[PDB]
């Protein structure tokens, strides 16, 4: 029942995300050359989303079998991929938001900033910045066997003297730098962009251009709402279990895995929001 529907949801999200990301990557590689900054950002976002989606079947297997049957090296690389690509996807979303804000609200500086070379430099900086968490997950990640339960679990290993403190600090740091900063940046940038576009003479000139402005506002609101709805529940759940109270129930476990599923649904839906809705991408596809 629930397990069955839970794994069905996981499989559907995995398939949709993988297919969409692969299609976007294939279109960007061959059909549309990466000459603009936005194409480079979309390619990096699609790559990060695909690599995050690759992690999903292992988590589904852990949910079903209640144990980790793979090797220690595979667990380390899977954990590192998950953390690194989550950070890369979130930072790419944030940088796309900042890029569009700079394009609208700072048109003069956008000529000196939206160069494809600077986009590649920004992407390299993003990947290097996520490399810190990736290396941390490689070094500390692993698999350990618990004897009284006879269960092999794959996670990040910390010294047992202050394992709880290290885990809580890591959760707080990840929550901050992956939710609080990106959400605030996206909100501020998109709000300023919309406020500036409200004062553009072109958009308010005609009824059809007002319709175009309404469409742009709807797209921005959809992007922000999707990000918030997909990422807030899992982070709130993790924080509540880390500091609020500790409990273990079947319903709690099912809701936890559904929150993880929503977190992955964010990356699954990113190609639809950013690639299959850009007008330039639509023209290139047709």
């Amino acid at each position: 029942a629930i397990p069955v529907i839970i794994t069905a949801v996981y499989s559907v999200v995995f398939v949709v995300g993988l297919v969409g990301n692969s299609l976007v990557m294939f279109v960007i590689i061959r059909y549309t050359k990466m000459k603009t900054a936005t194409n480079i950002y979309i390619f990096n976002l699609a790559l990060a989303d695909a690599l995050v989606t690759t992690t999903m079947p292992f988590q589904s297997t852990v949910y079903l079998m209640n144990s980790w049957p793979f090797g220690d090296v595979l667990c380390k690389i899977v954990i590192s991929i998950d953390y690194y690509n989550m950070f890369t996807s979130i930072f790419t979303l944030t940088m796309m938001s900042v890029d569009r804000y700079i394009a609208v609200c700072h048109p003069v500086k956008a000529l000196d900033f939206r160069t494809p070379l600077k986009a590649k430099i920004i992407n390299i900086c993003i990947w290097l910045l996520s490399s810190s968490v990736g290396i941390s997950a490689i070094v500390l990640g692993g698999t350990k066997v618990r004897e009284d339960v006879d269960v092999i679990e794959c996670s990040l290993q910390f010294p047992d003297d202050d394992y709880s403190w290290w885990d809580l600090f890591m959760k707080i740091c990840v929550f901050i730098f992956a939710f609080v900063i990106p959400v605030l940046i996206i909100i501020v940038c998109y709000t300023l962009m919309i406020l500036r576009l409200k004062s553009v003479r072109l958009l308010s000139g005609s009824r059809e251009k007002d319709r175009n402005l309404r469409r742009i506002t709807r797209l921005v609101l959809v992007v922000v709402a999707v990000f918030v709805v997909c990422w807030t529940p899992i982070h709130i759940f993790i924080l509540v279990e880390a500091l609020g109270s500790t409990s273990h129930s079947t319903a709690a476990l099912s809701s936890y895995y559904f929150c993880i599923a929503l977190g992955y649904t964010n990356s699954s839906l990113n190609p639809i929001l950013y690639a299959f809705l850009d007008e330039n991408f639509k023209r290139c596809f047709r």
């Binding site: 992690t55 988590q59 852990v62 949910y63 209640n66 899977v78 954990i79 998950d82 953390y83 989550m86 990640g141 679990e153 794959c154 996670s155 990040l156 885990d167 959760k171 990840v174 992956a178 899992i234 759940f237 993790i238 500790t246 273990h248 476990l253 936890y256 895995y257 929150c259 993880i260 977190g263």
Partner: peptide, 9 residues
């Protein structure tokens, strides 16, 4: 995220 944390179950 969250699928690789030390859960009790």
């Amino acid at each position: 995220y969250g699928g690789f944390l030390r859960r009790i179950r």
